[PDB]
Amino acid sequence: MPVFHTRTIESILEPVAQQISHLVIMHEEGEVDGKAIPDLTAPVAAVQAAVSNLVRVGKETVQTTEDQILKRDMPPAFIKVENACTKLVQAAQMLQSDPYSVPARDYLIDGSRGILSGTSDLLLTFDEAEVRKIIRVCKGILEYLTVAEVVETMEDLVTYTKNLGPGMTKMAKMIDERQQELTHQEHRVMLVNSMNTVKELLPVLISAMKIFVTTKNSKNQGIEEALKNRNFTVEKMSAEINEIIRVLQLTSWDEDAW
């Protein structure tokens, strides 16, 4: 299936996904069981090897990973491609005997779709775990942002900026690659626009902090405003970050996790 919910996963399974459409499209007209195809004992031996490596890696991915969802969603994707691969092999034999078998073409098709489908699930499941890595980072920035309300000195400000800076950088780099892989404009825009705002406001949030931490130091000066202006940027940025979490959340949540 067109389970290409990513621009990379798409560019990977698209080419072969097309060829499969033909086989089904042609096998429907009766033009598939037509030709007497050569020996697929060599090529089918390749995919059988290719699938073994894919499965192997996926098995390791689960081994290492800390993501419990990916830990329990990957294994099946393995089984899928694994037995869909056997149908592929079977068809190769059926054809090695009779290059005209229409049921061999049935397996030849059902198997190709199983390989392409399983591969999709595999990648998609893995990717969704990567999206949760982003969500985590964002949820981290969200937390520290509130810490900006307890900063009462220049030394605190120095520390705060030193900390926010890095995470602010990581989530910025993560959202960058992220928006590129998206397959829907609307999402990409929000993701991009929202992250930009966060970038725009960061220096503003630091100003509001310096002004406050200073005006408060400059004792005997209007401070109910500096506070309000600092708490606003904190709120604005926090809101933008939630739109990001929400978007990333909408574009990856596979409901087997309830």
Binding site: L40, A46, A50, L54, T61, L122
Partner: peptide, 25 residues
């Protein structure tokens, strides 16, 4: 990890060769 995509390209390629070995006319 970022290999899963590697092996995925290999199975996506093998399946391709097999499919195109049935394509001709």
């Amino acid at each position: 990890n970022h290999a899963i995509y590697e092996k995925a390209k290999e199975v996506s390629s093998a399946l391709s060769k097999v499919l195109s070995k049935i394509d001709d006319t």
